Design an enzyme around this catalytic site. Structure first.
Site, short mmCIF file in Angstrom:
data_model
loop_
_atom_site.label_atom_id
_atom_site.label_comp_id
_atom_site.label_asym_id
_atom_site.label_seq_id
_atom_site.Cartn_x
_atom_site.Cartn_y
_atom_site.Cartn_z
N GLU A 197 -0.73 1.89 6.25
CA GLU A 197 -0.56 0.54 6.82
C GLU A 197 -1.84 0.10 7.53
OE1 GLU A 197 1.64 -0.53 10.71
OE2 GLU A 197 3.23 -0.52 9.18
N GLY A 247 -2.56 -5.53 4.79
CA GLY A 247 -1.20 -4.99 4.80
C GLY A 247 -1.14 -3.53 4.37
N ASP A 305 -16.43 -5.10 -4.21
CA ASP A 305 -16.25 -4.06 -3.19
C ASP A 305 -16.19 -2.63 -3.76
OD1 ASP A 305 -15.88 -3.10 -0.55
OD2 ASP A 305 -13.71 -3.52 -0.60
N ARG A 365 -13.98 4.83 -1.46
CA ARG A 365 -12.64 4.56 -0.91
C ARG A 365 -11.74 3.63 -1.77
NH1 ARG A 365 -16.38 1.79 1.74
NH2 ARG A 365 -16.21 -0.51 1.67
N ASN A 366 -12.38 2.85 -2.65
CA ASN A 366 -11.72 2.02 -3.68
C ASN A 366 -11.64 2.59 -5.10
OD1 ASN A 366 -11.65 0.09 -1.62
ND2 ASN A 366 -13.72 -0.58 -2.12
N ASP A 418 -9.11 -2.09 -6.37
CA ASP A 418 -9.33 -3.10 -5.31
C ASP A 418 -10.48 -4.08 -5.56
OD1 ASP A 418 -6.98 -2.55 -3.85
OD2 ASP A 418 -7.92 -1.03 -2.64
C1 LIG Z 1 -5.48 0.67 -4.96
C2 LIG Z 1 -4.64 0.71 -3.71
C3 LIG Z 1 -3.95 2.03 -3.51
N1 LIG Z 1 -3.23 2.45 -4.57
C4 LIG Z 1 -2.57 3.61 -4.50
C5 LIG Z 1 -1.80 3.99 -5.75
N2 LIG Z 1 -1.96 3.19 -6.79
O1 LIG Z 1 -1.06 4.99 -5.77
C6 LIG Z 1 -2.58 4.44 -3.36
N3 LIG Z 1 -1.90 5.63 -3.32
C7 LIG Z 1 -1.88 6.73 -2.43
C8 LIG Z 1 -1.26 7.88 -2.89
C9 LIG Z 1 -1.20 9.01 -2.09
C10 LIG Z 1 -1.76 9.00 -0.83
N4 LIG Z 1 -1.70 10.13 -0.02
C11 LIG Z 1 -0.81 10.05 1.15
C12 LIG Z 1 -0.52 11.44 1.70
C13 LIG Z 1 -1.81 12.17 2.04
N5 LIG Z 1 -1.52 13.45 2.74
C14 LIG Z 1 -1.42 13.29 4.20
C15 LIG Z 1 -0.93 14.58 4.84
N6 LIG Z 1 -1.84 15.69 4.54
C16 LIG Z 1 -1.37 16.93 5.18
C17 LIG Z 1 -1.94 15.85 3.09
C18 LIG Z 1 -2.43 14.57 2.43
C19 LIG Z 1 -2.73 12.21 0.81
C20 LIG Z 1 -2.97 10.81 0.27
C21 LIG Z 1 -2.39 7.83 -0.37
O2 LIG Z 1 -2.92 7.90 0.89
C22 LIG Z 1 -3.28 6.67 1.54
C23 LIG Z 1 -2.45 6.70 -1.16
N7 LIG Z 1 -3.31 4.01 -2.31
C24 LIG Z 1 -3.98 2.85 -2.35
N8 LIG Z 1 -4.68 2.47 -1.26
C25 LIG Z 1 -5.11 3.34 -0.18
C26 LIG Z 1 -4.89 2.66 1.15
C27 LIG Z 1 -5.39 3.55 2.26
O3 LIG Z 1 -6.77 3.89 2.07
C28 LIG Z 1 -6.98 4.56 0.83
C29 LIG Z 1 -6.57 3.70 -0.34
#
Ligand SMILES: CCc1nc(C(N)=O)c(Nc2ccc(N3CCC(N4CCN(C)CC4)CC3)c(OC)c2)nc1NC1CCOCC1
Ligand SMILES: [Cl-]
Ligand SMILES: [Cl-]
Ligand SMILES: [Cl-]
Ligand SMILES: [Cl-]
Length: 270
Positions: free
Chosen positions: A28, A32, A151, A155-156, A169
């Site tokens: 979050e 958003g 961009d 990170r994207n 993104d």
């Molecule tokens: C393109 C925008 C976007 N698309 C996706 C998508 N299409 O699926 C997406 N998915 C995603 C999937 C999984 C995770 N995880 C969460 C648990 C974590 N754990 C934590 C706990 N720890 C012990 C072990 C690891 C490892 C990462 C995720 O983390 C943020 C994101 N995210 C997108 N945007 C982000 C927004 C935040 O910035 C980065 C880009």
């Protein structure tokens, strides 16, 4: 015709909100959040997805923009599955973007996690350079549709189940010299950002230009200084990334040219 294509693309892009179930929050922030979901598919089964939550004019451009990106089909560019717009209790529209789930999250975090014990194993040089190829391939596809990313950064870029990278993104330290100065942005400006992304990858997630601050950047660049070569980065790799930051953007390689260099270098590894 132009219109006819837009009208069709528009048809396809919307998903009935009852085909979609939201889950927990994956991250979050300001514009958003990203949340997990299930998308009910044509075949009767559900699919795990990701769900991004972001004037009728800005609503319509969101929709038109969504329609064009939905048309993008390449395995190194993130597939837009569709969009929902659900209205608030206060009455503002809430536009949801639906994306295929990317199990491993973003590339920048992943690289950082890899330097921890319990994170992904140490990433071998071959894998890192494969990430670069995937991204170059993604950006080649885009530049051929004359679409600008704007961009590009680690990170994207997103990592799929199978460790394929795809661009998504579509940040002073990522911005080309010419774009800092004359606010003007070509594919060659994306090329600049690519070159920086390569460096983020090769350093396993360092912030570009340690010891230089954002406000210092135009002059730092204007005096010919560029990112330094990371330790254990092949000179050939560094040459490829340095060509991305040439002062004249006409002198920079195309993505197609970079991709071909990156794949050749990868093939030459034992
Ligand atoms: C393109 C925008 C976007 N698309 C996706 C998508 N299409 O699926 C997406 N998915 C995603 C999937 C999984 C995770 N995880 C969460 C648990 C974590 N754990 C934590 C706990 N720890 C012990 C072990 C690891 C490892 C990462 C995720 O983390 C943020 C994101 N995210 C997108 N945007 C982000 C927004 C935040 O910035 C980065 C880009
Ligand atoms: Cl729901
Ligand atoms: Cl995809
Ligand atoms: Cl770091
Ligand atoms: Cl540097």
């Amino acid at each position: 015709s132009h219109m006819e294509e837009l009208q069709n693309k528009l048809e396809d892009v919307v998903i009935d909100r009852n085909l979609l179930i939201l889950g927990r929050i994956l991250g979050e922030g300001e514009f958003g959040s990203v949340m997990e979901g299930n998308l009910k598919q044509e075949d009767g089964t559900s699919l795990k997805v990701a769900v991004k939550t972001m004037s009728q004019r800005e609503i319509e451009e969101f929709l038109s923009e969504a329609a064009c990106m939905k048309d993008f089909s390449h395995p190194n560019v993130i597939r837009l599955l569709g969009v929902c717009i659900e209205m608030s209790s206060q009455g503002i529209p809430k536009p949801m973007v639906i994306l295929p789930f990317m199990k491993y999250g973003d590339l920048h975090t992943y690289l950082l996690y890899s330097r921890l014990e319990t994170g992904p194993r140490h990433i071998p040089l071959q894998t890192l350079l494969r990430f670069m190829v995937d991204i170059a391939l993604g950006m080649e596809y885009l530049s051929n549709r004359n679409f600008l990313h704007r961009d590009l950064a680690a990170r994207n870029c997103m990592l799929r189940d199978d460790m394929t990278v795809c661009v998504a993104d579509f940040p002073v330290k990522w911005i080309a010299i010419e774009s800092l100065a004359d606010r003007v942005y070509t594919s060659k400006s994306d090329v600049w950002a690519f070159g920086v992304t390569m460096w983020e990858i090769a350093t396993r997630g360092m912030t570009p230009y340690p010891g230089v601050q954002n406000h210092e950047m135009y002059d730092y660049l204007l005096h010919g200084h560029r990112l330094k070569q990371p330790e254990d980065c092949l000179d050939e790799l560094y040459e490829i990334m340095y060509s991305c930051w040439r002062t004249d953007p006409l002198d920079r390689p195309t993505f197609s040219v970079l991709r071909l260099q990156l794949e050749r270098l990868l093939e030459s590894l034992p």
